[model samples]
Target chain A: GWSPFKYSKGNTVTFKTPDESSIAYMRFRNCVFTFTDPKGSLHSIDVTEVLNNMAKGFRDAQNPPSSFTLGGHCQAPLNAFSFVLPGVNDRATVATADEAKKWENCDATLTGLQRII
Target chain B: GWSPFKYSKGNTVTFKTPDESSIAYMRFRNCVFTFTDPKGSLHSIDVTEVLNNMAKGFRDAQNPPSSFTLGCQAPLNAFSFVLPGVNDRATVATADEAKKWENCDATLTGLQRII
Candidate 1:
């Protein structure tokens, strides 16, 4: 689940498990989105290539892309899914069941999940 | 100067230098206060003994203690200072100039200098 007041300046937010035992702190700054996953591993993505795709979505809808969705099967190993960003089309496939389960049912919306910098 | 929102639930806050190059992220949780200093070294203090002192101050003042102060001389090595919590009185002396310099002119107040 997400915490209240998920947004902070410099583009940071935190997500935790129901019992608050695990934490995933995220920050998007300098065009790079950084994720410190529940296990304390860091993953980052540079969005320079996808900027045009996002801009096209913005132009078409007259509204900026606000969130990204994470979808995969919890029990399946090597489940194929994409972190649905504003305009990018890239599939993120996990090789193991543990990896798939780690991100199951996670989503990053503008107000609740994705925070502005 | 301290950040606008210095306090967070579970007793956490962040302090940054003027240029934002140095960051001091602090958290007081599970009866231990953890400090991620500017240079990324972790320092911690267990407040078991100091809790009694803090309670004394709280009783006398009739208000909960809110902040702490850090005082030291920047130019001197082994400058004596204390992180003045609500009621505790223990001086923390640094052995090296570099250590002293890292924490010079820093204060953690309830609102500002000593946010």
Candidate 2:
């Protein structure tokens, strides 16, 4: 699933769940970014790293979205399915309102070609 | 043209003049490097930046490889050429030595794939 534009360290960014990311444990990492400076110009930055850490494991580690209906047995007597649970230390279980704000902040004064809107 | 193996930072590397480089001033930058450690295993590293600064301008800044006879002619086609003196700071000015070291001089250890 894709994420909405999230604000962090005065900058705006968006992340997605791709099949492969540079670092293993982070499901939501690479993002498209737009940094708004004091001059009211929008600067678009690509392939930016976001608020993901090792705490956020694979997508399967996330909390399930569905509440399944219980069934005793099928017509053909098939009962191989079992209940599944999310991982204990997964970050998706305890995400914050400002999810990646603390991790994506930058304090450097923009210079050179980076200063042009 | 391609380059023979060169050494730097206690490692071996080779750089070539690609069509486009990240920086405008450097003609030779990205290289293929082999790091040798104590255990004698070969560790090849690709697309490594090395030995290049802004000082080495373009490939045309290097010394020319010809001794041509001067000709006398008119403005457009008759006479347009340079003496072709190599720039004061070009690293690959004249040329490389015909012979290079076959074996790396560093000591390599174990096997590992870098992320």
Candidate 3:
């Protein structure tokens, strides 16, 4: 049911799971860096790491860029709160199902992504 | 099922050999008109003249439209009739073939349209 649209306003990453216990790697709509440390007890610390890592990748592109968080409502809430490491044009930022679910928490987390226009 | 979204209203001005020589010009759709010869002695002449005389042109449009008469029917009754020189849509008024002498009734002329 999810068809790709041409001009996405911001990255909206999604994580899906057949069941819970462990998750698949994170999949991205497009390319971007992330910073987050999983296995941490904080509600959002690890998830936010995804954005920080991205900020490091594209030091010049993020204009007055302020990092923020947007993700799922579940524990290890699936989210992406940065605009780091940038490129756009429908290519998968993270290819490979394995690569896609690297930051997943099937038992605890699911997916994440960075916002973009 | 006849979908109402689109159809062709052909007023092609039809006519054919009445019988080797005489013929009858016929009625048209998209407009109600007929210019048929009551008595004639020629095969294709009457048919051609009818089309040419009609200066109007509308192949397909709505408000009303046309399609070649085409279909199948059971000839169980053995009493069916598709008259000659009836309209501008078909080779004849009804169909082009019969029920294979099974019931021996006819089917419509093969239909066609813009879409």
Candidate 4:
């Protein structure tokens, strides 16, 4: 239930897993980075690091900049459901199963970044 | 699931319920609106339509402007849960019950949009 906000440039941004044992899927929203190059040019870049799997986490841009500022929202996936579709009968059970699957696949964690305003 | 974006002046922005039967909650994030009045003045507004209950929906601001733009990220609350503590219980029923509780309590229902 974290609220969305634009975070400014700061290394204070930190993330950790439980006991550093469990792997987590970090979800980000409208993530944008501002980089300053050696030529004294500033650039705004969108973070396009695709989540391949457990092996992939953070990736740097093709051209590294001198100093950069990170801004955006990040979240971790959670195992939870919002509704409990009633399955009183076989027919209802089938419908319920599909509903669950849709959520599992389309939930915020799996499908992060809805839109950029 | 929907993407977040800033929508400019338009009248086609519409929302519908499931056959207009079931009452659904609309959750919006970072919603902001820009209003232009008849006097040609501009104003930036935030959609603060608090989620009161089923009886509550969209609310307009006082001294309404001529036109406005809606922008924000929105998502409907769904029944879902994340993993529990590693040291948690091993009973299936226990996990199920806890998961259900977490989802319902934290679910995005009862919460409405800000505009």
Scanning candidate 3 chain B in windows of ten residues, the lowest lDDT window is B41-50
- As for candidate 1, its clashing pairs are A11-A117, B107-B114, B108-B114, B109-B114, B112-B115
Give TM-scores for every candidate, taking all chains together and pairing residue i with residue i.
0.20, 0.18, 0.14, 0.20
Descending-lDDT candidate ranking: 1, 4, 3, 2
Report the TM-score of chain B alone for all candidates: 0.28, 0.25, 0.16, 0.32
Candidate 3 TM-score over all chains jointly: 0.14
Q: Write the per-residue lDDT of candidate 1 for residues B1-115, one digit (tens) a residue.
A: 4323322212223233344321222222123333433454433333322322332333434433344222231321112212222111222233452454344222222322221
Ranking by TM-score: 1, 4, 2, 3
Q: What proportion of the true contacts does each candidate reproduce? A: 0.00, 0.00, 0.00, 0.00
DockQ of each: 0.01, 0.01, 0.00, 0.03
Off by over 4 Å in 1: A1-29, A37-39, A58-93, A96-98, A103-117, B1-115
Candidate that would win on TM-score:
1
State the lDDT of candidate 4 residue by residue for B17-95, as single tens digits: 3333322344444333343323333323223222122113223434323222221622221112111111113322365
Better of 1 and 4 by DockQ: 4
After best superposition, candidate 1 residue B101: deviation in angstroms? 50
